[PDB]
Amino acid sequence: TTTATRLTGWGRTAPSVANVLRTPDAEMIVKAVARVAESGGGRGAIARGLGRSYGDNAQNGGGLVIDMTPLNTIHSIDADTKLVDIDAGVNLDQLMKAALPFGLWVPVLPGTRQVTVGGAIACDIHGKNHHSAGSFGNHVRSMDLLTADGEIRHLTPTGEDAELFWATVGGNGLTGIIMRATIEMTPTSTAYFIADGDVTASLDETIALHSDGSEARYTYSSAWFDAISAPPKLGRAAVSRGRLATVEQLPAKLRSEPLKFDRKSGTYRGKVQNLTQFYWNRAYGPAGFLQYQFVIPTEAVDEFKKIIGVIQASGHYSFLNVFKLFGPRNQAPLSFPIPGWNICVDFPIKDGLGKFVSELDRRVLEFGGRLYTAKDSRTTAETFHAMYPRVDEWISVRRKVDPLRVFASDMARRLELL
Ligand SMILES: Cc1cc2nc3c(=O)[nH]c(=O)nc-3n(C[C@H](O)[C@H](O)[C@H](O)COP(=O)(O)OP(=O)(O)OC[C@H]3O[C@@H](n4cnc5c(N)ncnc54)[C@H](O)[C@@H]3O)c2cc1C
Numbered sequence: 467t468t469t470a471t472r473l474t475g476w477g478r479t480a481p482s483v484a485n486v487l488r489t490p491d492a493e494m495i496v497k498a499v500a501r502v503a504e505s506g507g508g509r510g511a512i513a514r515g516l517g518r519s520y521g522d523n524a525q526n527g528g529g530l531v532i533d534m535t536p537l538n539t540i541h542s543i544d545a546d547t548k549l550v551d552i553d554a555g556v557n558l559d560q561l562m563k564a565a566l567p568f569g570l571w572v573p574v575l576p577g578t579r580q581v582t583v584g585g586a587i588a589c590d591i592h593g594k595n596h597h598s599a600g601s602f603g604n605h606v607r608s609m610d611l612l613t614a615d616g617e618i619r620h621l622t623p624t625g626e627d628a629e630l631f632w633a634t635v636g637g638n639g640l641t642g643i644i645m646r647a648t649i650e651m652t653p654t655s656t657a658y659f660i661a662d663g664d665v666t667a668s669l670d671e672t673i674a675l676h677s678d679g680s681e682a683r684y685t686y687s688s689a690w691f692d693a694i695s696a697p698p699k700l701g702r703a704a705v706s707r708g709r710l711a712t713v714e715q716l717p718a719k720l721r722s723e724p725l726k727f728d729r730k731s732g733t734y735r736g737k738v739q740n741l742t743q744f745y746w747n748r749a750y751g752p753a754g755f756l757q758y759q760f761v762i763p764t765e766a767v768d769e770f771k772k773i774i775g776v777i778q779a780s781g782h783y784s785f786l787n788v789f790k791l792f793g794p795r796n797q798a799p800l801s802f803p804i805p806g807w808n809i810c811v812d813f814p815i816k817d818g819l820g821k822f823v824s825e826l827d828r829r830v831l832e833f834g835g836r837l838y839t840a841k842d843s844r845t846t847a848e849t850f851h852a853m854y855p856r857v858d859e860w861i862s863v864r865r866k867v868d869p870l871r872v873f874a875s876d877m878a879r880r881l882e883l884l
């Protein structure tokens with residue numbers, strides 16, 4: 467029934483071997499969880515989606531991994547309630563294509579659509595529109611969770627099961643297997659964006675642009691960010707901001723099918739873009755690259771500037787940098803986003819990199835920030851627990867729901883969440 471398999475995250479690092487169950491039969495999945503539970507836990511089980519997480523959260527060395535990608539049925543779409551009811555293995559590209567004709571838009575879109583609904587929930591993913599829409603968790607109306615007791619719990623965000631529900635959002639699969647979920651989509655009349663572009667010349671100017679009050683005028687906003695230039699050109703950014711377009715905003719040619727599927731000069735106004743236009747590690751790493759993401763609380767703006775400073779001075783040079791100001795956070799104890807300054811950098815693997823990122827960890831930690839489980843397989847339990855003050859609250863919920871540790875992963879063991 468299972469296939470022993472070498473697994474890594476997307477950046478192809480920290481491999482381990484697991485027995486992979488890959489079946490479209492939900493009953494086989496229930497059986498397998500039950501079997502692990504009846505062996506008393508053993509080395510446990512974790513779910514896997516499309517493997518786009520860079521870390522070790524979707525692998526389980528010496529244990530069971532359940533590939534959820536064959537559970538990919540879209541059960542219902544409702545344009546009045548805006549609700550879609552889909553299997554957890556459904557991916558966002560497939561969902562985008564299916565929902566567009568109903569005038570529905572996937573409410574949170576990350577940098578790639580090759581992620582499953584299960585993975586979107588388990589990592590509580592965020593997008594270019596976080597400051598207006600929150601993260602993926604905010605839009606989950608209900609979900610079916612297969613728990614350690616072999617039963618499938620129906621969870622809602624305010625029901626009796628609220629606590630389990632919000633430990634599951636951002637829970638990295640460690641409360642059980644999300645089988646199915648109901649997501650509230652965003653209404654739209656077109657599949658296009660209308661975007662305003664701006665360029666800055668300094669880190670301070672980037673920050674002022676995000677603090678002047680104009681962010682509140684766009685539903686989506688992110689920026690490419692210079693991390694190699696010494697000050698004051700350090701932290702200059704190419705900012706892409708916008709909102710979904712109405713039909714009467716489209717070029718006349720595109721009005722026939724508005725819901726169709728698919729420095730210096732970079733200043734513009736009312737440019738009309740499809741998703742691809744508006745929006746290396748796997749190809750070259752991990753002989754090549756270490757991806758690194760963190761968020762610093764809004765009020766700690768100067769501490770943020772300094773970390774940026776430390777990065778440019780490091781001698782570790784990242785071209786691919788993405789910056790964004792996160793909005794308010796949600797109820798999930800282990801959710802990554804907090805309101806604040808968020809950035810992803812991609813470092814070439816070079817001598818002294820490990821020691822340098824350990825120093826970064828310390829700084830993000832002291833300044834009240836955190837790393838993202840979706841981008842990590844290197845940090846320590848001590849660092850992670852410190853970055854997530856609600857971790858003991860979350861661990862308690864997990865103990866109530868999985869007393870025998872039927873659910874387990876490489877990440878759970880490394881970060882002592884098991
Ligand atoms: C090119 C690229 C761009 C990205 N951009 C963004 C971005 O803009 N914003 C962002 O937040 N993230 C981004 N990510 C990270 C990615 O969106 C998340 O890691 C996401 O969780 C991956 O989904 P997946 O289905 O591939 O999950 P996997 O990587 O397979 O698994 C991730 C976690 O989800 C759990 N999981 C998966 N399915 C289930 C299930 N059915 N039940 C319970 N748990 C489950 C796994 O156990 C694991 O803990 C990006 C990744 C890549 C490679």
Ligand SMILES: *N(O)c1cc(C(=O)N[C@H](C)c2ccccc2)cc(C(F)(F)F)c1
Nearest residue numbers: 577592593594688788789790808809810
């Ligand atoms: N980080 O603040 C951040 C990263 C992305 C993102 O899509 N990153 C992936 C790995 C990527 C980077 C560069 C080139 C290709 C892919 C997205 C955001 C968001 F805030 F959601 F816009 C933030």
